[PDB]
Every structure is written in structure tokens, then in C-alpha cells.
Design a protein around this nucleic acid. Structure first.
Ligand SMILES: [Zn+2]
Ligand SMILES: [Zn+2]
Ligand SMILES: [Zn+2]
Lengths: 380, 54, 66, 38, 604
DNA sequence: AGCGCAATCAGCTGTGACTACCT
DNA sequence: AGGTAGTCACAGCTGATTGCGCTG
């Protein structure tokens, strides 16, 4: 039988009257039921992650001049890559991005593997005006990525993302041997095609554990990149995976004190123009080297300079707040004022924390579970 | 008949050049009335233009 | 010298008034002097009939929803 | 012609709904179309 | 009743106030329902009002409905009874139901199931449970012509008699006047006389919840009845027909307006019904895919109602087709049913259930009311605003931008009146510049543009000036197909011109920009159809009119259907950057030269 | 220079509004 | 002084004619 060939639904039978006017009570119940439309979690997916050393390979062949994506594939690809780099560094604190451009059967390492987003964005903007010629070489790009990532620590997840526009690749040697070597090296390879499905990309993605997708339009391209942003699930505990990193305090210099010492920034020292000789900035806790941008690994002593708030922003996932016990107002024989907003409790349901047994209204409960991520009573 | 009709109007439509009629008022000699009034009568459409001359 | 009311309007309405002058829709040639592409000189004794005609033209191609 | 362009632009761009809206402006994004936002 | 301010005041008629503002509803004595959308019970009130009344306007804040006899017939067709509808109407009134609505509802809903019309063995019989009503209608002279051979009485069991097949429309027209409306209920669950086919829709064609409501209202209590479902072109309309055909599980007949809609319906059936091509046939005198002995037959109008000599193969196909019963004769583009030759199409074939599908039910000559008895009551009317709120219908930003008439054109417009002024405001140089600017701006951002333009004489010089493809309309079959095919999957060309050809349901690809110039007079149907070619601010459609011309009144009176649907037409007076770039007719010389060619028609 | 597919014209009809004549 | 059937524009369909192509 069919669902719609039976009896027609009467959704208006829910409302009923006993005292001629209880519709106000019904609409109050409906308004209360309208709230709490979430699961008390902003993400609700992967609550953790792992250090990812991701390499992004961009096709630089003549096929990038095609106008499937306005204005051409290269410009849309680089714009979406800038967006992807920004989002990936936003959602991954201690990750690194490398960019490889393959052209004329050779692969050029456009950018070193590091955690600076500004350098990658500047490199992409510079590469916007590149010359699209020749044919891509997946073998050379994968060889460069494997050579770079072979010496990386085992606990980090090694990933390669390939943007393959051209349907043909030139390999100076057998590629399936390289795929076997990558599989033995536990390097994940993901490919996002632009024209159509290529067998070698499917085999590579299946064997290395990655995913192979083909772009339908620019929105689908952005969706695939956004999916690639998310970190992979992390095993319980592998080994002593740790890392020596510093937390450079942003100590600026004021001439009101006698210790106002101007210093050139190491990052700005490599620029053609005059480096910024500002009063202060981020001083390395180990060698007192000065940097302006974070997170940037120290050039001198090799220490990783990260920002503590960036690491702390993900701490609420480790310790989620347990849902408060929903209690009807009549059954709660205690105070009738919310502990968070001091407002009078007039809702039919009152939420009580399991730890401190305090009183929270619906709005304060939603705010605590969604945004605050901490019980105000438990803090005291 | 159709193939001669579709071409007989090509030359007919290209003969006429001006459609709007020129309506310039060509007033004749002025007539002097009382109180220094002067009236001009159009010789093409009979338009009367009465004016006071300083 | 001429005495009357100067009318300032869009060029389309100036052409409409010029057409009304020659069409004798008012009974006479009271649209006497044209001075500018957007300005005309009209006798003041029957400025109301021009208002009525313009209003009729305006609400003719309006389709009031009443 | 040089003057013909100016005359035609003056006639077309400001015929009915400009000789009064501009006067009001002198005396005084969601719903805007894409060509009106550039 | 009183006209102190010219308004019908009914303050004293409905003074009941138990709850101040609990009930989001208003009633009127004659008949009308006002609904408050900003209410927590909005969905329940909408579900109640859709099943009992048809809408008249659905703006963003206060929905307004109307109570009609056919709406109450449809409501009582479903399991809803008089007591339930009355008690739930008084449940949400906030003012008290006037004692002019209760009596009207009682009178309408009491006489619904008294008279039935049934089809059996290619014979039409009218059966009534109450024997008295037969004698009550026996005295009607018009009914006596239907009964052939003295109608001895057909004593069975319940009193019924035969009626003439070719005069079924007349008796349906008379019955509503006799306060005894006829119903067309087909209980396809238990027939055992019809060779039910093995059609079965694939379990991968998911449908939206709004289509679920329409389908459920179609089969209220396990039976299928004739009705009309109104869904937008971008929305799923053919899917509803395919699902209904699969559920009825009988010999289906599909009727279209054009000879290209039959291929569209065949493709839809092949996509969402899992039917072999042997059973599927197209009857449009183009391929002749053996329509004899078929499960689902797809044909078109203007062929089943020929008044002239018919082809031998077509004559044999019609002879075969007029000799068996049909289950769920689907009619597409139901708005053009009340025609001189299309009304007889329903009476020339015999079918149990008649389903009408359309997107624009509006029509002039007030013949839509005739469709209430020609087919059935308006079953479903989609709420376009809430449909585009769900994101499944493109949120089109409607624009009504007018262009002033040039002085060289307005003199000729006001000088002539004998139908020669159509080309004057159509070929307005300012409107030409506006259209060119819009085309260029939306091409600079890679937007697909469909430019509708009636009065193909103007379109000829409108399209060659921009050097863009156009469809004159009687060009060919192949050229139009290839142009529409290369319009979508080609970045070089993304704008086409259509002349009254796209004023129906075709397979036009997804488009974002529609620019119509010089449409028909006051056809709300044409404007609604043209809007439907865009939805599928994701998109926006423009209408260009010439000020101080009849096109202004035409545009005003042709948008009242869309504003009732909830669309707002913003008025655009100035186009930004009009003088920034170069446009055609820049100087007065070519503008005044255009007068010579636009006056050169002289079709006298 | 015999068949056969395809382009083409005739006849009827739908949609919408404009217009001449007379009780 | 007022209203309905011709009539024009533009599109559709089906029913025939009638005119160009038809093998390594
Ligand atoms: Zn350091
Ligand atoms: Zn609170
Ligand atoms: Zn707590």
C-alpha cells in the first residue's frame, strides 16, 4: 500500500478545549516546544583531531585555462584554495600546509610546509598570474610530497590533497609502485577532479585511504574543500606524541619606561622593502627573537610559537557540559529565581545542574550548553 | 501572389520621407486695437496672438 | 509682451501638449509660444482644462485597483 | 556629434522621474538589485 | 451593510470575545477567512483552511481565504464532517461565527453524496442512494434528453438510470444549479473488471512534503477522485502525476498542449515509474509507436477533438481508444481546458478519474469556474512564498522597471490610435538601452538570460541589433532544439530571445534572469508562466514597460496574480551606470531614424 | 531517375484585446 | 448613448503535398 492513499491527516486535532480558552495554554506549550531545537552541541561530529601535514597539489597545465569555472579554472581554484587555507588553519591550530604546482611534466615546490597562513595566501596570489602550459605530472608531485613527509613523525597524520584538472598525467616511471610506497608510508592521498573520473586517481585514493571526487560546479568544489577542512578521527593513544612549543607574549615597548627597545622583525627582514622596526611584538621565549605574526615557527632556535587562546578554544570539546535535569516547576521545592539571570521562574520546566543543584531557566540553559560551555555555579 | 506581395511593398515603404507635418505659425501683418494692443493672425491655421507692445 | 503661465514638465508631456494644440482637443490654439524643449507658454484663463486632460491621460493608463 | 550625445543623454536620463527626485535629494542592500549596488 | 466610510462593517454581527488574541482567524458574514501568519498555530490553521477553503491572497503577514461551495464539497469529500469543520471553525474565530456562514456551510455540505456518477462497461450511469432525488430531478426538461429509449428505469438492487455519453457535460452543468453536485469517485482498490497494469514507481524518487499533502488529499479514504493540483513549474508537478498514475495502477492517459510535451511526459515516466517502452506509447502522428494495446498512453490536445477528416491510422487509433475505460486521465496545462474544442475532449473519451495539473490557474473570460464541474474542485494550491522559503523554489527578485518615452516617439504614439501604437512603445529607444544594459550586466556575471518578447516584428530588429540568437517561432523543429540545447552547456552564449513560444511548459534549462518586453495585454497566465521559467536572491526577473503608455496599465493589471501569490514588484526608475558605458541609440539621429522604420509597417 | 525521409503549405483552433454598427 | 461579433497579431496542432538525397 501507499502512505498517502490511506486516511488524510488532520493535524489540527491536537488543540482541544475544556474551559473555552485553553488555546492560550496550548500556544504557550507550542512556544515552549519551539525552543530547544539543537542537540546542545555546535558541531556534534569529531570532538578531537591530530597534527596534519597536508600537501596541496595544484594542476598547472593548459587545461586550467578552461572557462568551466568563471573566469577560468585557475582563478576559481586559487580563490577556493585561499578560502580553504584560511578555514583549515582556523579549524587546525598546529597543522601545516604545503603547496606544490606541477607544470610541463615537472613539479615545483611553490611553498614550504609550514603553519603561516599569510605566506600561503601571498604565494597563491602570486601564482594567480602564472603561465598554464604543458601537462601535469602526478608522479613527480607525489614523489616530492613523499620525500618531504617521510621524515615526519609517525603520530602526525600525513595527507596529500591533489587538484587534478587535466585528465592526462606524464609519469617518468611506473606510478603503481609509487602508490605502493605511499601506502607503506601511511600517507593519505585525496584527489578532487575537475573534468571527469580518471582511473589512476580512483586507484590512488582507494589504496591510500583517501577520497576521490569530481566537481559538478563551484559550490560543489567549495563543499568538497570544506569537507577536506575537517580533521580525521584520532586513535586513543599511540605513543609519547608531544612537541616543544613556546608561547610568546605580545610584549610591546612603551617609551614611558626605560626598557623601550626597538627591534627588527625576523619575518620582515627577508622583505625587499624596509623591515618593520616596531617598538615590540612577539619575542621568542627561548632566544628572544622578534616576530610579528603567529603562529610562526621560530627561524633561529626552531621552537614553535603558538597562541594560547587558539589552543584553548578547543578545550570545551574535551570536557563537555552534561545536560541539566529537566524538572517541572511545581515539583521543584526550592528557590524560584534563576541562578544565571536572576529572573523569576515562570516556565513550566526548570533545569537543575547535576553538580551544584542550582536553578537555570530555559534561556540560560540554552546559553550555557551552546555558548558558555561551563556551569556558572560549578565555577564557584 | 505571396512572393510578389512580399516584394511590392519594399519600394512603396521607401518613398515617403517626412510624416510629421510642420506647424510653423506664419503670422501676417499686425492689427492695432485699443490700449496699445497688437494682434497677429496666423495665415496657415488662423492662430491669434495678441500682445501688448511696450 | 505676452502674459500667461509658464509650464515646466518632462519632454514627453511637452510633446503631448504640443499635440493637443494642433489636435484642437480644447477648442482653440491657446498653446501659443514654445520657448524650451521642456518649457511652454500657456494662457492662464484655461489652465484647468489642461489639468483635467493631463489627469485623464495619467489615470487612463493606470488601472486603479479600486 | 559631440552636442548630440549630451542632448540625448540629458533628455533620456532625466525625463519624468528625475526632475523631481533629484530636487528632493538636493533639498534633503538586501532589497537593492545587483546593478544598483555597483 | 453600513457605508459610513464606504466599508462593509460587521462589528455587531460577530461580537463574541472570550479570548482577546488567542485565535489567529477572522470570519465574514457573506464569506471570507482572514488568517494571521505570525501565530504559533500557523501550520495547523493553514492545514485546516487549505482542506476547506481556497486561498485568494497569501502575503507575508495576513493570509486571506474564501469560502465557496466547491471548497466545501472538496472538504466533505475528505472524511471531514459538518460537525468537525463547524466546531474547528468556531474553535479559531476570535470573533464568533456569523449566522450566515453556518447555514451556508450546512446547505453546501449536506447535499454532497446524494448523487453519484459511475462508469461501467463503457456505459455512464448516475446512481443515488436516496430514490426521492431521482423523481425531484425527473421534472427537469434538460435531463430528459440524456436518457435514451424512454429510460424504463434500470431497476437494480438504490435507483439509477443511464445517461447519454456525449451530453454528460450538460447534466454536470445542470446538477450544480439543482443543488445536487455530481462526484467522480473511483474505487480502484476493488474493480476486478479493469486490467490493472504492473506499473510501480522506483524506490528512489523522493518527493517533498508539500507533494505528500496534495497526493494524500487526492486519495482521502482509499478512493481516487477528479481534482486539480496547482504546483509551480520549477516545483515538482510531473512527479506528482507520475506518482498518482503509479498509485492508481490502471490504464493511464496523459494529455498535453504541445507536441513536445508528450516527449517530456514520456521522459518523466521513464525516469520515475519503471515502465518498459513496449507499454509506453506516444500518439502524436510523428512516430506511431503502436498505441494499440498500451498501458500508459501519452497524446496531446487539438488531436482528440478534430472537427475535420482524420488520418486512417489516426482514425483506427481513435476507434481503439474510444472503446475502453481509462484510469486517471491526466490533463496537463489544465488552465486551457474551458475551450471550444478542448471541453469536448473530456466528453469524447471515457475515464474514471480526471486529474488536472497546472501552475497558473488564472484565465480571462471567467471560464475557470466552469472547470469546477468540467473536471472537479481545486484540490491543492501550493503556497509559493513558503515554498521558496524552504529553498526548493528559487527566490526570484521581481522588478518592474519603466523607461520614459522619447519625445520623437511619444508624438507618434499620441497621434495614432488605430492599433498602430503597439510598435511605438515596444520599440522605445530607452527601453532598448535598458534591455541592452541588463543583458550586458548579467552576462558580465555569467547569468543565463531568457528574453521573452511578443510582437515578433519588434523582436526581429531587437535581436539582430544585439547579434544574439532568437526563436521566431515558426523557424523549424531542429533549429529551436539545437539553440535551446547549446544555450545551457556553452559559456560563449548564455542569452536567448523567445517570442511567445516559451509561454507554455517546455524543457527549457535552468535560467536566472528573465527580461520580458511587450507581452500580451492583460494575461496574468502569461506573466505567471514566464516567472515559472525562472524559479526551479538566487534569480531575478525584469519587466520593461514604457511610461505614459498602455503598457503601464497592462503591467499593473498583469501582476495582480503574482502579488496574490506573494511577490512584490519593486519599481526601478534609474539604472546605475547607464551613462558609464556605451549603449545603442546614443544620439538623436538614429533614434529619429528609427521612427521611419517603426512607422514603415503600414499593414493596411 | 524510382523510393524515401524530411521540409513545407492548408485548414482549424486557442488567447488576448481592438473596433465598427444600431435599438 | 451602450454592447457583442468580426478581426488582427501570434502561437499551436494535424492533414496532405513536393522536393532533395540515395551504399565501397
Ligand atoms: Zn627562538
Ligand atoms: Zn536564567
Ligand atoms: Zn553546575
Amino acid at each position: 500500500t501507499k502512505r498517502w492513499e490511506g486516511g488524510y491527516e488532520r493535524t489540527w486535532e491536537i488543540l482541544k478545549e475544556d474551559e473555552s480558552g485553553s488555546l492560550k495554554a496550548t500556544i504557550e506549550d507550542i512556544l515552549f516546544k519551539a525552543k530547544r531545537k539543537r542537540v546542545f552541541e555546535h558541531h556534534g561530529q569529531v570532538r578531537l583531531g591530530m597534527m596534519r601535514h597536508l600537501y596541496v597539489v595544484v594542476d598547472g597545465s593548459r587545461t586550467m585555462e578552461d572557462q568551466d569555472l568563471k573566469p577560468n579554472r585557475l582563478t576559481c581554484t586559487l580563490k577556493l584554495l585561499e578560502y580553504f587555507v584560511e578555514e583549515y588553519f582556523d579549524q587546525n591550530p598546529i597543522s601545516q600546509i604545503g603547496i606544490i604546482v606541477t607544470k610541463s611534466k615537472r613539479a615545483e615546490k611553490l611553498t614550504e610546509l609550514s603553519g603561516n597562513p599569510r605566506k600561503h595566501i601571498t604565494s597563491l596570489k602570486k601564482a594567480v598570474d602564472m603561465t598554464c602550459h604543458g601537462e601535469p605530472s602526478l608522479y613527480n608531485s607525489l614523489s616530492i610530497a613523499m620525500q618531504t613527509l617521510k621524515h615526519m613523525p609517525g603520530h602526525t597524520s600525513r595527507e596529500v590533497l591533489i587538484i587534478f584538472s587535466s585528465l592526462t598525467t606524464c609519469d617518468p616511471s611506473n606510478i603503481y609502485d609509487l602508490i605502493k610506497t605511499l601506502k607503506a608510508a601511511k600517507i593519505r592521498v585525496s584527489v578532487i577532479g575537475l573534468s571527469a573520473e580518471v582511473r589512476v586517481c580512483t586507484v590512488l585514493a582507494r589504496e591510500t585511504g583517501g577520497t576521490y571526487h569530481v566537481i559538478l560546479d563551484e559550490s560543489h568544489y567549495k563543499e568538497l574543500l570544506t569537507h577536506h577542512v575537517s580533521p580525521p578521527p584520532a586513535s586513543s593513544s599511540s605513543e609519547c606524541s608531544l612537541i616543544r612549543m613556546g608561547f610568546p607574549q605580545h610584549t610591546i615597548a612603551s617609551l614611558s619606561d626605560q626598557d623601550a627597545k626597538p627591534s627588527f622583525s625576523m619575518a620582515h627582514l627577508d622583505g625587499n622593502t624596509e623591515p618593520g622596526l616596531t617598538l615590540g611584538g612577539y619575542f621568542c621565549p627561548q632566544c628572544r627573537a622578534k616576530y610579528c605574526e603567529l603562529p610562526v615557527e621560530c627561524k633561529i632556535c626552531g621552537l614553535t610559537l603558538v597562541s594560547a587562546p587558539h589552543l584553548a578554544r578547543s578545550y570545551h570539546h574535551l570536557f563537555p557540559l552534561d545536560a541539566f535535569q529537566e524538572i517541572p516547576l511545581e515539583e521543584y521545592n526550592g528557590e524560584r529565581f534563576c541562578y544565571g539571570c536572576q529572573g523569576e521562574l515562570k516556565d513550566q520546566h526548570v533545569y537543575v545542574c547535576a553538580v551544584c543543584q542550582n536553578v537555570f531557566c530555559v534561556d540560560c540553559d540554552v546559553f550555557v550548553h551552546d555558548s558558555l560551555h561551563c556551569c556558572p555555579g560549578c565555577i564557584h | 501572389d505571396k512572393k510578389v506581395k512580399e516584394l511590392r511593398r519594399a519600394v512603396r515603404s521607401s518613398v515617403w520621407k517626412r510624416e510629421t507635418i510642420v506647424h510653423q505659425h506664419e503670422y501676417g501683418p499686425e492689427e492695432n486695437l485699443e490700449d496699445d494692443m497688437y494682434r497677429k493672425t496666423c495665415t496657415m491655421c488662423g492662430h491669434e496672438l495678441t500682445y501688448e507692445k511696450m | 509682451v505676452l502674459k500667461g503661465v509658464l509650464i515646466e514638465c518632462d519632454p514627453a508631456m511637452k510633446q503631448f501638449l504640443l499635440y493637443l494644440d494642433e489636435s484642437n482637443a480644447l477648442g482653440k490654439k491657446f498653446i501659443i509660444q514654445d520657448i524650451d524643449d521642456t518649457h511652454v507658454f500657456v494662457i492662464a484663463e484655461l489652465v484647468n482644462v489642461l489639468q483635467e486632460r493631463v489627469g485623464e491621460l495619467m489615470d487612463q493608463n493606470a488601472f486603479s485597483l479600486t | 556629434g559631440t552636442s548630440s550625445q549630451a542632448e540625448a543623454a540629458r533628455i533620456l536620463a532625466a525625463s519624468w522621474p528625475q526632475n523631481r527626485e533629484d530636487e528632493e535629494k538636493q533639498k534633503l542592500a538586501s532589497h537593492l538589485f545587483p546593478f544598483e549596488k555597483l | 451593510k453600513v457605508d459610513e466610510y464606504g466599508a462593509k462593517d460587521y462589528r455587531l454581527q460577530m461580537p463574541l470575545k472570550d479570548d482577546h488574541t488567542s485565535r489567529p482567524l477572522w470570519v465574514a458574514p457573506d464569506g471570507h477567512i482572514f488568517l494571521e501568519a505570525f501565530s504559533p498555530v500557523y501550520k495547523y490553521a493553514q492545514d485546516f483552511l487549505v482542506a476547506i477553503a481556497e486561498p485568494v491572497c497569501r502575503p507575508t503577514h495576513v493570509h486571506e481565504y474564501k469560502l465557496t461551495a466547491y471548497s466545501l464539497y472538496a472538504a466533505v469529500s475528505v472524511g471531514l464532517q459538518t460537525s468537525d469543520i463547524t466546531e474547528y471553525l468556531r474553535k479559531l474565530s476570535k470573533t464568533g461565527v456569523p449566522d450566515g456562514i453556518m447555514q451556508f456551510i450546512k446547505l453546501c455540505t449536506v447535499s454532497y453524496g446524494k448523487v453519484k456518477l459511475v462508469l461501467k462497461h463503457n456505459r455512464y450511469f448516475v446512481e443515488s442512494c436516496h430514490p426521492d432525488v431521482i423523481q425531484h430531478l425527473l421534472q427537469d426538461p434538460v435531463i430528459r434528453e440524456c436518457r435514451l429509449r424512454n429510460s424504463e428505469g434500470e431497476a437494480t438492487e438504490t435507483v439509477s438510470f443511464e445517461v447519454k455519453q456525449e451530453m454528460i457535460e450538460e447534466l454536470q452543468k445542470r446538477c450544480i444549479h439543482l443543488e445536487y453536485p455530481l462526484l467522480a469517485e473511483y474505487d480502484f482498490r476493488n474493480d476486478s473488471v479493469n486490467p490493472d497494469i504492473n506499473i510501480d514507481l522506483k524506490p528512489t524518487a523522493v518527493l517533498r512534503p508539500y507533494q505528500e499533502k496534495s497526493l494524500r488529499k487526492m486519495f482521502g479514504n482509499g478512493r481516487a477522485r477528479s481534482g486539480v493540483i496547482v504546483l509551480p513549474c520549477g516545483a515538482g508537478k510531473s512527479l506528482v502525476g507520475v506518482t498518482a498514475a503509479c498509485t492508481v495502477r490502471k490504464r493511464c492517459l496523459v494529455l498535453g498542449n504541445s507536441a513536445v510535451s508528450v516527449e517530456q511526459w514520456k521522459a518523466q515516466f521513464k525516469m520515475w515509474s519503471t515502465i518498459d517502452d513496449s507499454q509506453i506509447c506516444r500518439f502524436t502522428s510523428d512516430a506511431k509507436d503502436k498505441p494499440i494495446g498500451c498501458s500508459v498512453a501519452i497524446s496531446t490536445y487539438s488531436m482528440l477533438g478534430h472537427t475535420t477528416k482524420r488520418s486512417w491510422e489516426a482514425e483506427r487509433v481513435m476507434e481503439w481508444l474510444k472503446t475502453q475505460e481509462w484510469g486517471l486521465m491526466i490533463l496537463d496545462e489544465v488552465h486551457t481546458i474551458p475551450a471550444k474544442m478542448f471541453r469536448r475532449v473530456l466528453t469524447i473519451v471515457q475515464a474514471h478519474c480526471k486529474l488536472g495539473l497546472t501552475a497558473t490557474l488564472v484565465r480571462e473570460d471567467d471560464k475557470i469556474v466552469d472547470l469546477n464541474f468540467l473536471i472537479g474542485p481545486k484540490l491543492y494550491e501550493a503556497n509559493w512564498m513558503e515554498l521558496q522559503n524552504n529553498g526548493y523554489i528559487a527566490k526570484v527578485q521581481c522588478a518592474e522597471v519603466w523607461c520614459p518615452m522619447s519625445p520623437e516617439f511619444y508624438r507618434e504614439y499620441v497621434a495614432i490610435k488605430t492599433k498602430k501604437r503597439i510598435l511605438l512603445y515596444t520599440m522605445n529607444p530607452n527601453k532598448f538601452r535598458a534591455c541592452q544594459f541588463l543583458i550586458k550586466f548579467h552576462e558580465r556575471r555569467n547569468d543565463k538570460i531568457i528574453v521573452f518578447a511578443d510582437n515578433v516584428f519588434a523582436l526581429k530588429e531587437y535581436a539582430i541589433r544585439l547579434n544574439k540568437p532568437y526563436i521566431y517561432g515558426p523557424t523549424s523543429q531542429g533549429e529551436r532544439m539545437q539553440i535551446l540545447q547549446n544555450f545551457k552547456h556553452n559559456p560563449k552564449i548564455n542569452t536567448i530571445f523567445i517570442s511567445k513560444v516559451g509561454d507554455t511548459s517546455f524543457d527549457l534549462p535552468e535560467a536566472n534572469v528573465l527580461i520580458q518586453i511587450s507581452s500580451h495585454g492583460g494575461s496574468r497566465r502569461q506573466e505567471a508562466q514566464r516567472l515559472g521559467r525562472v524559479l526551479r536572491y538566487n534569480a531575478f526577473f525584469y519587466s520593461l514597460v514604457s511610461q505614459d503608455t498602455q503598457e503601464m496599465a497592462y503591467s499593473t493589471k498583469r501582476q495582480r496574480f503574482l502579488v496574490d501569490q506573494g511577490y512584490s514588484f519593486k519599481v526601478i526608475t534609474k539604472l546605475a551606470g547607464m551613462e558609464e558605458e556605451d549603449l545603442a541609440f546614443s544620439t538623436k539621429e538614429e533614434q529619429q531614424q528609427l521612427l521611419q522604420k517603426v512607422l514603415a509597417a503600414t499593414d493596411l
